[PDB]
């Protein structure tokens, strides 16, 4: 909604670098490591 966030969401959509796209369980375990 805020042009800031539209840029942020389009940026990430446009990020084609495969290294930034964590699968879900990868992603989950990572957050658990934090504050867990």
């Amino acid at each position: 909604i805020s042009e800031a966030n539209q840029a942020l969401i389009e940026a990430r959509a446009n990020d084609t670098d495969d290294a930034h796209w964590s699968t879900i369980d990868d992603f989950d375990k990572r957050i658990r490591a934090r504050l867990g």
Binding site: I9, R12, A13, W21, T23, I24, R30, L35
Partner: protein
């Protein structure tokens, strides 16, 4: 089955929200995160075009009661969790 992928900056977006809860309301942190994992793994995969558009082809789904939403994109092959922003 569509394949499910999460940008890393979501991790950023998350703790940017947890901040408003740690120390004072640490119970919310697990609540809101478990809502998020729900929406991402069950709610959105169930019917990804049903949830309201955010802008252009992007969609979102509020993790109610929290006023944070999950912005996302749905091609015929994939579902890409793009952000978790406030609203």
């Amino acid at each position: 089955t569509r394949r499910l992928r999460v940008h890393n900056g979501v991790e950023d977006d998350l703790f940017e929200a947890f901040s408003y809860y740690a120390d004072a309301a640490p119970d919310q942190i697990d609540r809101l995160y478990n809502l998020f994992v729900d929406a991402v793994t069950k709610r959105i995969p169930q019917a990804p075009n049903a949830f309201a558009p955010l802008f252009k082809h992007y969609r979102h789904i509020y993790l109610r009661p929290f006023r944070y939403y999950v912005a996302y994109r749905t091609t015929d092959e994939a579902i890409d969790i793009l952000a978790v922003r406030h609203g």
